[PDB]
Design an enzyme around this catalytic site. Structure first.
Site, mmCIF file in Angstrom:
data_model
loop_
_atom_site.group_PDB
_atom_site.id
_atom_site.type_symbol
_atom_site.label_atom_id
_atom_site.label_comp_id
_atom_site.label_asym_id
_atom_site.label_seq_id
_atom_site.Cartn_x
_atom_site.Cartn_y
_atom_site.Cartn_z
ATOM 1 N N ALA B 12 -10.394 4.976 6.489
ATOM 2 C CA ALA B 12 -9.197 5.258 7.272
ATOM 3 C C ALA B 12 -8.003 5.575 6.388
ATOM 4 O O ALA B 12 -7.122 6.339 6.792
ATOM 5 C CB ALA B 12 -8.869 4.079 8.183
ATOM 6 N N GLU B 62 -19.051 4.378 0.694
ATOM 7 C CA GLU B 62 -19.932 5.426 1.187
ATOM 8 C C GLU B 62 -19.475 6.786 0.672
ATOM 9 O O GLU B 62 -18.276 7.016 0.501
ATOM 10 C CB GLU B 62 -19.983 5.427 2.718
ATOM 11 C CG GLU B 62 -18.658 5.659 3.422
ATOM 12 C CD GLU B 62 -18.777 5.561 4.934
ATOM 13 O OE1 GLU B 62 -19.895 5.307 5.428
ATOM 14 O OE2 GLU B 62 -17.753 5.734 5.627
ATOM 15 N N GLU B 245 15.088 -2.814 -3.885
ATOM 16 C CA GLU B 245 16.069 -3.461 -3.023
ATOM 17 C C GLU B 245 15.470 -3.888 -1.684
ATOM 18 O O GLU B 245 15.861 -4.931 -1.148
ATOM 19 C CB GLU B 245 17.263 -2.528 -2.820
ATOM 20 C CG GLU B 245 18.026 -2.258 -4.113
ATOM 21 C CD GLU B 245 19.190 -1.303 -3.937
ATOM 22 O OE1 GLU B 245 19.349 -0.754 -2.829
ATOM 23 O OE2 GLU B 245 19.944 -1.094 -4.910
#
Ligand SMILES: Nc1nc2c(ncn2[C@@H]2O[C@H](COP(=O)(O)CP(=O)(O)OP(=O)(O)O)[C@@H](O)[C@H]2O)c(=O)[nH]1
Ligand SMILES: Nc1nc2c(ncn2[C@@H]2O[C@H](COP(=O)(O)CP(=O)(O)OP(=O)(O)O)[C@@H](O)[C@H]2O)c(=O)[nH]1
Ligand SMILES: Nc1nc2c(ncn2[C@@H]2O[C@H](COP(=O)(O)OP(=O)(O)OP(=O)(O)O)[C@@H](O)[C@H]2O)c(=O)[nH]1
Ligand SMILES: [Mg+2]
Ligand SMILES: [Mg+2]
Ligand SMILES: [Mg+2]
Lengths: 429, 423, 429
Positions: B12, B62, B245
């Site tokens: 993903a 994979e 920051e």
């Protein structure tokens, strides 16, 4: 010295000043820009009283423009004599008074009043000597009713000695342009009777009449309706701005006229008045300017002097003229209308002769009258108040702003206190 | 002189990176061949010849989706020593990504970091695009972050992650991923980022006029967020807020490091008109619940800290009036003992388009996100009440009590936001 | 003689100096290159105080530019007036302070401070006579907070007699651009109250207000936000750089104003301010420049003088002008705002008249004020500190740098020591 600060309000009174400062422009040679182009050096000798001479050959109108919606300020600045003013002094709200006296005096009147009272303070600090304040507004609208009357009570808290005059239009006798014109009169009557030193009172209908009777006009515009008051206001202080054979100013007019401080509600008078072509077929001299004043039709307040009694009479002339031509005319006319006056004043005719005419005709005269004829108009107005009050209509607006009946009732009683006092000296002789 | 490398873990994250570096090449005018016809050292480095390479590492167990880059249109951009493949996937098994297969090729990927860390000198942050859905994007994620705090410790480590959806949920053992990965990403990550798939759909459906979105278009929304977070490093605005920051601004207590991203304005092409998109108009749309990308109602909690990263055409006084409105409301409310709750960042660069005037990224570390964990704790209890699927994690070498050790660990996580919510 | 060394820091304070040295460029006829093009020979007579005249018709800004990341140094050198500086003096780090005071004061503050303190020494050796040091930075960021405050304690160890002034911006009252703005204020308050001789304090919000109230601007940029401080800083030393009818410099402003060394936190004031076209419709003279100063809205620190008490008043004029036009205006305004001052000083109005105007309008004035109105802002800031401290949040950064609670507490107590002393003389009269 003795400079004068100008305040406006309302929507009618602004357009009058939008014509009035045009009158003062050519009474001092002031261009539409702000510079100087006059030739007579008597203008520059007393130029300071209505104008601050700003830096670099400039002259700005010492005036405070006040509205509550940006429409009329846009109309002034876009049309003639709008760029002559200072953009710092266009001090105006955003809401509009809604034709409510209580909106102009309680809720929205408290907002913009702080922005004005610094500008009043900034001009009064800048003035070398201060003479008095002048106000031009309505008594029928919302902004002219509440906002102007809220100012003057704060000014009487400031200055005890400075004079105050309002050129306030009387609500109309017969035509009803305003639906709530008693509710904009009666709540405005109470402020005027307390702490206004002299108070100018002009009916609407006679202004239509004088523009139609003497001049015989067909399509009278507000540029010619409101122009007659603009020449009228200039004739009040025309002995100040220029030397004369008998000078005058705003304090001389006050103490001569007002016999008791609760009786100071005056009426104007202007002469001569012709048509465009019917202007030479008349001996336009002092006796014609004499008898043009004293008739009933010349009064811009629609009232009959035959149905009343005078108290005092002021008269301001303009242009070079002799005196016995004036003085006997200013003496004999008290004897032909003898019973119309009152007994207890010998020679109630105040004469004032400047030595500068208007830009135009050779001689001119401004009449300032005081009589008991005006109280009979208020009995109509008190009837117009009570007709909308005996059913107690239109209260929920003022209740929504918050007001008891007693504030309506005592001001109506104080309106009747004006009734009880102009009738009192009229009943006396 | 300042750098920020990127790592992509799991399937993903790669498809996120396929659209991200698609956008970055369109930013600086880079071709797919690393060619362009100044200060961009954060995401790129220059070769001896006039070619630039991305600072990206693609790991997968994979060999499928990496071949889609090794044969795709963006083929010549990547160094072949960066493109790292495995043989057998974890295959939605967290114990395989954490113990079985990921322990073997862990040496190669970590070695590529120091090979990138030679030319880097202003190392200011890490990027780990990892999902919690797949086993490879989660099992490798825990093994990867342990060595880096041993490696660097002081350097910044950021995770633009994908939150598992409470309703539209694909796999089965997705509740098992989140509780196990909690101990790593709460003890290594400086500031993690949650993005749900579910809120993206209605943004695509209503606000983008396409009711049926594609995963190619889901990545386009997050890729605009990642760029505007880096909009101070890669360019020059009047108020450039660097990545050191944000972890110091947005973090009041060093465990609470879970804000949410919000991109705005999100319009369509036909709705590009009938609007004017002023700086006060669009920031109220930021705090709209249906414009954020996390399924959490912001009026179910309080804001601890808020950040606003502007770009395009912005005047700060015009934004000063816009921020003054949001403090002067009532349905939007803060944590009261934090009255200074805004971080503003302006860049004078327009939001580029991928095949408008200004754009806003909103980063709001709030207490509204804490209900999403409780919606996922409710999933994890019942699947563990049956002792279901224990024989796969124990079947791949994992303690049963290691679930139970991480079970109370979410309770100590959940009681944080509850404690900060009250005064 | 009496040359002045300039130090910058932060990210806001650099862009101010990126505009301020442009102001000094046309106040001395300095081109963007470094050569000279002026015509008035009064510039060259005292050119040395802000510029080293380098070899071969050159002039370089005697200034020390300090940052901690190469972005802002790149933006200065690429834009205007970047090649005018010396490339030896672009002394800047590589990390960026991370908006942490402790990073700018403990860890990364110790690195670049040695590179600066030679450049301070190299300029102070090169100067014939040294007057004092000036600093322009932030109090909200990291580099402006820690790095600038670390320098001044090392300078007070060096020079006892040399003056020191910081044009430090106050953290914002209502808008919160910085998340940790108490933690960049309170840790910076302790350095300023010890060893800064005078300290300039500017609120952010009033700078937005003055750019919007008087000027009526629509899209105010930092080139017009920060420009008002750039004219303000120039008006402090404008009596030094040119002769006057009553000269002044940085030591005369110090000993006149500061009554006790713990009370030296000042407020500015500048006049005149117009619009682009609303600039001639005003008598821009001394009494207009008088009353433009003393109102609440002209203060670039957002504070009401009505809710406080003054101690001393300085005023620096520019351009040729008379004196009784000034002096009575500089005397009478103490009597109208009589109760707002304090009893124990007769004639607390310090007047300073240079004889050179700004490049522009004919006359100008710079107001330097001191009042007890500023301590009421700190009670908000002490509340903003304690709101983020009563839960003890944001500590692990400073704990990671290493700091006890007592350093937070005593500085908050020393902030309250500023509270206990501006209230003390305010309670007295
Ligand atoms: N002689 C004139 N009378 C006018 C003129 N305009 C309005 N009026 C009269 O004035 C009255 C209305 O008052 P204004 O014009 O001042 C309305 P204002 O701004 O005061 O308040 P709002 O009702 O809130 O707008 C009403 O009696 C009108 O008949 C004008 O130009 N000349
Ligand atoms: N009036 C102005 N205020 C500014 C400007 N830029 C920033 N600021 C304010 O200054 C504060 C931020 O400080 P800086 O700009 O100096 C950041 P600095 O280099 O000091 O440290 P870092 O946080 O490490 O970057 C914050 O309160 C801002 O609102 C400016 O150009 N003008
Ligand atoms: N952000 C994003 N998430 C996606 C996309 N496609 C699928 N997902 C989600 O990613 C999760 C699956 O993770 P993957 O990365 O594909 O799998 P993996 O980590 O490689 O592990 P295995 O495939 O099980 O070996 C699920 O929650 C999907 O809903 C996409 O295009 N973008
Ligand atoms: Mg009206
Ligand atoms: Mg996969
Ligand atoms: Mg900075």
């Amino acid at each position: 010295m003795r400079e004068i600060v100008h305040i406006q309000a309302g929507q009618c009174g602004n357009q009058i000043g939008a014509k009035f400062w045009e009158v003062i422009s050519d009474e001092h040679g002031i261009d539409p820009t702000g510079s100087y182009h006059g030739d007579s050096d008597l203008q520059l000798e007393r130029i300071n009283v209505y104008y601050n001479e700003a830096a670099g050959n400039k002259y700005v109108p010492r005036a405070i423009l006040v509205d509550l919606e940006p429409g009329t300020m846009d109309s002034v600045r876009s049309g003639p004599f709008g760029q002559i003013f200072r953009p710092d002094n266009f001090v105006f709200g955003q809401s509009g008074a809604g034709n409510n006296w209580a909106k102009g005096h309680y809720t929205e009147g408290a907002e913009l009043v702080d922005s004005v009272l610094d500008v009043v303070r900034k001009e009064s600090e800048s003035c070398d000597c201060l003479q008095g304040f002048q106000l031009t507004h309505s008594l029928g609208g919302g902004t002219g009713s509440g906002m102007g009357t809220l100012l003057i009570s704060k000014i009487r808290e400031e200055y005890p000695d400075r004079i105050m005059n309002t050129f306030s239009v009387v609500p109309s006798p017969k035509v009803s342009d305003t639906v709530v014109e008693p509710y904009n009169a009666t709540l405005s009557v109470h402020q005027l009777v307390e702490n206004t030193d002299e108070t100018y009172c002009i009916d609407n209908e006679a202004l239509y009449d004088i523009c139609f009777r003497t001049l015989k006009l067909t399509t009278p515009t507000y540029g010619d309706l409101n122009h007659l008051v603009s020449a009228t206001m200039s004739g009040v202080t025309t002995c100040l701005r220029f030397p004369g054979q008998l000078n005058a100013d705003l304090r001389k007019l006050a103490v001569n006229m007002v016999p008791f401080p609760r009786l100071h509600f005056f009426m104007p008078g202007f002469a001569p008045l012709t048509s465009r072509g019917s202007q030479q077929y008349r001996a336009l001299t002092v006796p014609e300017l004499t008898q043009q004043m004293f008739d009933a039709k010349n009064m811009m307040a629609a009232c009959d002097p035959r149905h009343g009694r005078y108290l005092t009479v002021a008269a301001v002339f303009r242009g070079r003229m002799s005196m016995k031509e004036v003085d006997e005319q200013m003496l004999n006319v008290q004897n032909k209308n003898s019973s119309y006056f009152v007994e207890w004043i010998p020679n109630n005719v105040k004469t004032a002769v400047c030595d500068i005419p208007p830009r135009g005709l050779k001689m001119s005269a401004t009449f300032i009258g005081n009589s008991t004829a005006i109280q009979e108009l208020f009995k109509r107005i008190s009837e117009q108040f009570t007709a909308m009050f005996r059913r107690k209509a239109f209260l929920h607006w003022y209740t929504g702003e918050g007001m008891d009946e007693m504030e309506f009732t005592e001001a109506e009683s104080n309106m009747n206190d004006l009734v009880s006092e102009y009738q009192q000296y009229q009943d006396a002789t | 002189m300042r750098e920020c490398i990127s790592i992509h873990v799991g399937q993903a994250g790669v498809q996120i990176g396929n659209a991200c570096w698609e956008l970055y090449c369109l930013e600086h005018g880079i071709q797919p061949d690393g060619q362009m016809p100044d200060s961009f050292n954060t995401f790129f480095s220059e070769t001896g010849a006039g070619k630039h390479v991305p600072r990206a590492v693609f790991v997968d167990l994979e060999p499928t989706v990496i071949d889609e880059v090794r044969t795709g249109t963006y083929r010549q951009l990547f160094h072949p020593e960066q493109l790292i493949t495995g043989k057998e996937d974890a295959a939605n098994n967290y114990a395989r990504g954490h113990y079985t297969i990921g322990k073997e090729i862990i040496d190669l990927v970590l070695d590529r970091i120091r090979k990138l860390a030679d030319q880097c000198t202003g190392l200011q942050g890490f990027l780990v695009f990892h999902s919690f859905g797949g086993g490879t994007g989660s099992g490798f994620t825990s093994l990867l972050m342990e060595r880096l705090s041993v490696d660097y410790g002081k350097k910044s480590k950021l995770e633009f992650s994908i939150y598992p959806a409470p309703q539209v949920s694909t796999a089965v053992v997705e509740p098992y991923n989140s509780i196990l990965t909690t101990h790593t990403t709460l003890e290594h990550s400086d500031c993690a980022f949650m993005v749900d798939n579910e809120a993206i759909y209605d943004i695509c459906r209503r606000n983008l006029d396409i009711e049926r979105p594609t995963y190619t278009n889901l990545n386009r929304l997050i890729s605009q967020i990642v760029s505007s977070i880096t909009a101070s490093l890669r360019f020059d605005g009047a108020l450039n807020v660097d990545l050191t920051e944000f972890q110091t601004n947005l973090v009041p207590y060093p465990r609470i490091h879970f804000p949410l991203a919000t991109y705005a304005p999100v319009i369509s092409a036909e709705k590009a008109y009938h609007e004017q998109l002023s700086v006060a108009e669009i920031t109220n749309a930021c705090f709209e619940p249906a414009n954020q990308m996390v399924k959490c109602d912001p009026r179910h909690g309080k804001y601890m800290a808020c950040c606003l990263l502007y770009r395009g055409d912005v005047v700060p006084k015009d934004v000063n009036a816009a921020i003054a409105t949001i403090k002067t409301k009532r349905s939007i409310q803060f944590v009261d003992w934090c009255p200074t709750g805004f971080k503003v960042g302006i860049n004078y660069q327009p939001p580029t388009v991928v095949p408008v005037q200004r754009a806003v990224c909103m980063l709001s570390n709030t207490t509204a996100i804490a209900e999403a964990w409780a919606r996922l704790d409710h999933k994890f209890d019942l699947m563990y009440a049956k002792r279901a699927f224990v024989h796969w994690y124990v079947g791949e070498g994992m303690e049963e009590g290691e679930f139970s050790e991480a079970r109370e660990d979410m309770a100590a996580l959940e009681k944080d936001y509850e404690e900060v919510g009250v005064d």
